[PDB]
């Protein structure tokens, strides 16, 4: 019931930020803040009223809330939303990151701020719709709908220091990758729908009805291959990964647009929700390839991030390595590894949000991003280097932050399933510590090798410090007490794991 409002409130809010620019340039930021606060409040109200902690696993489908409306009755297409523990967790994370993104661009008084805010809210609404839709056409619709505002934000409101041609090139590369992968996913969806139509005679796109689809061996492999191409481009999984550092480099200066659409794990959610229950045997056979791809992605992202002279590209390849960890977790078939994957995804979103916000604030202070131009910044900034030290400590898998709980439950489940990939991924954790230390010592420690890093810099504002400390508090509380997050998503993970291991 509240899910259509959960999707439409960002869209109506973005339309309001566009329309209320005539009353002032400082108005659409307040409107966007109000509507993301309303979205987050609705998500938290769904969390409180759901009773997710006391919910027990009953098998797919099992939704805490469900909405149906016919959209295209010729193909049996419905605007069909459904929320359970995992989807609610991702919706809450999306709302929190949207509030952080709206706050992160609070000092932009540009003449066209209203369209920027509409663009951001439409990205957030598309991400929420991806997390909520259980109709194949609607899920694909939101999946490709959240990319046009992404493209326009990167291309027009991107990094002003870089040339326009590089911004358009990076945005076009990102759009081409994501939309071609979405098209392949659509072809897999259509072939699955047609297989179900020949087997049954009923036109439908519903996830619940397409679950019991009798398919031969080889067709199911192709369908899961298309789904995995989409969910591996947007994860990212190597070699389908260059769009992520190219778009992070040319992202807008404040870093809000990084948090809005690039930083939310829609692809791994789709792997958990759509790839494994619909195609269990084919995913079971593709598990070694995906797990070795995750190992190669971890080490490729580590060696990439160590060799990066750009901070934003370093955080992008950190995201690549941690998403490789999640990809290893997803194809294990273990409840403990799945719960660790959920915790790791939430904690990695929080840590990368803190890292990108601190990098944006640092670029506001110093107007450069090259590691050969900073050094010894601890003595010049009041708050930024210690908070960045905390967040780089979080991204190396340090206990006390939720990332450690994430990768360690992932590796416990993986060692229960596959030990060699577990031990190689732990060496990947060593590599993660290596590049985090390299970034810390190239950025804030040492002696200054530039003139702009030889002067005293102004301290951070109250709102940026407040939101970064909020991220710090959330990461620490997730590291020390991850139990409410674990009990929130216990039923959905249980249903997915039981459906995966009971149909092989």
């Amino acid at each position: 019931m509240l899910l259509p409002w959960l999707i439409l409130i960002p869209f109506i809010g973005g339309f309001l930020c566009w329309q209320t620019e005539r009353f002032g340039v400082k108005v659409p930021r307040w409107i966007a803040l109000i509507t993301m606060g309303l979205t987050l409040a609705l998500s938290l109200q769904l969390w409180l009223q759901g009773g997710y902690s006391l919910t027990q696993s009953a098998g797919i489908p099992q939704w805490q809330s469900e909405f149906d409306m016919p959209w295209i009755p010729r193909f049996g297409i419905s605007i069909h939303l459904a929320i359970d523990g995992l989807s609610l967790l991702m919706v809450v994370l999306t709302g929190l990151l949207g509030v952080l993104a709206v706050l992160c661009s609070w000092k932009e008084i540009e003449k066209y701020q209203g369209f920027f805010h509409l663009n951001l809210m439409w990205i957030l609404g598309g991400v929420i719709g991806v997390f909520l839709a259980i109709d194949m056409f609607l899920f694909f619709f939101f999946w490709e709908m959240m990319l046009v505002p992404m493209y326009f934000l990167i291309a027009l409101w991107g990094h002003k220091a870089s040339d326009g041609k590089t911004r358009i090139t990076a945005a076009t590369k990102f759009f081409i990758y994501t939309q071609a992968s979405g098209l392949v996913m659509l072809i897999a969806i259509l072939a699955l729908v047609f297989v179900h139509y020949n087997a049954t005679g009923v036109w439908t796109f519903n996830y619940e009805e397409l679950l019991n689809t009798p398919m031969s061996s080889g067709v199911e492999y192709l369908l899961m291959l298309g789904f995995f191409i989409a969910f591996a481009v947007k994860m990212p999984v190597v070699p389908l990964h260059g769009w992520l550092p190219d778009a992070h480099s040319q992202a807008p200066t404040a870093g809000s647009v990084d948090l809005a659409g690039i930083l939310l794990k829609t692809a791994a959610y789709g792997l958990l929700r759509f790839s494994l229950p619909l195609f269990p045997n084919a995913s079971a056979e593709f598990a070694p390839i995906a797990m070795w791809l995750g190992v190669i992605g971890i080490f490729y992202g580590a060696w990439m991030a160590f060799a990066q002279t750009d901070i934003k590209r370093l955080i992008a390849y950190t995201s690549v390595s941690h998403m490789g960890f999640v990809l290893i977790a997803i194809y294990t078939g273990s409840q403990l590894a799945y719960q660790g994957a959920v915790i790791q995804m939430i904690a990695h979103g929080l840590s990368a949000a803190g890292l990108f916000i601190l990098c944006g604030q640092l670029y506001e202070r110093i107007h450069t991003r090259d590691m050969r131009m900073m050094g010894g910044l601890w003595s010049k900034m009041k708050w930024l280097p210690a908070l960045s030290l905390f967040f780089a400590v979080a991204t190396l898998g340090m206990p006390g932050t939720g990332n450690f709980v994430g990768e360690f439950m992932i590796l416990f489940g993986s060692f229960q399933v596959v030990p060699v990939i577990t031990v190689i991924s732990t060496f990947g954790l060593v590599f993660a510590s290596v590049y985090s230390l390299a970034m810390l010592h190239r950025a804030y420690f040492g002696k200054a090798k530039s003139q702009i890093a030889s002067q005293e810099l102004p301290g951070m504002s109250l709102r940026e410090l407040f939101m970064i400390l909020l991220l710090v508090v959330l990461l620490v509380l997730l590291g020390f007490y991850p139990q409410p997050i674990l009990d929130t998503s216990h039923s959905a993970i249980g249903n997915i794991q039981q459906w995966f291991v009971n149909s092989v």
Partner: protein, 111 residues
């Protein structure tokens, strides 16, 4: 001055967590906090890059050691199903009555 005293206080707290924990995961929390405080205190004079390189080498070698400790933790949880020390010394000889290879590997990575 305050940075030094905060780092040493966190070192003391993490070592107390290490020596007071009843399970291997909480002791790993204290273990890695001790390693982090060692890194933050070795490179205290951050202006000299040699101190930073020393802190790098210290944290990388200790992180390799902590990865071996994690190997032992994974093996022990996969075998006995628990991470409590008393539960190890209770239901280890019953489980390892037939085979002792996995316990040998667990003790090797503990070493």
């Amino acid at each position: 001055y305050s940075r030094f005293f905060a780092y040493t206080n966190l070192f003391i707290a993490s070592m107390v967590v290490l020596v007071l924990a009843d399970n291997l995961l909480l002791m790993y929390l204290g273990w890695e906090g001790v390693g982090l405080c060692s890194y933050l205190l070795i490179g205290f004079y951050y202006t000299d890059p040699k101190n930073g390189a020393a802190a790098m080498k210290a944290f990388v070698v200790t992180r390799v050691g902590d990865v071996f400790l994690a190997f032992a933790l994974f093996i022990l949880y996969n075998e006995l199903g628990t991470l409590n020390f008393r539960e190890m010394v209770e239901l280890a000889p019953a489980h390892f009555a037939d085979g002792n290879n996995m316990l040998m590997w667990a003790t090797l990575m503990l070493l």
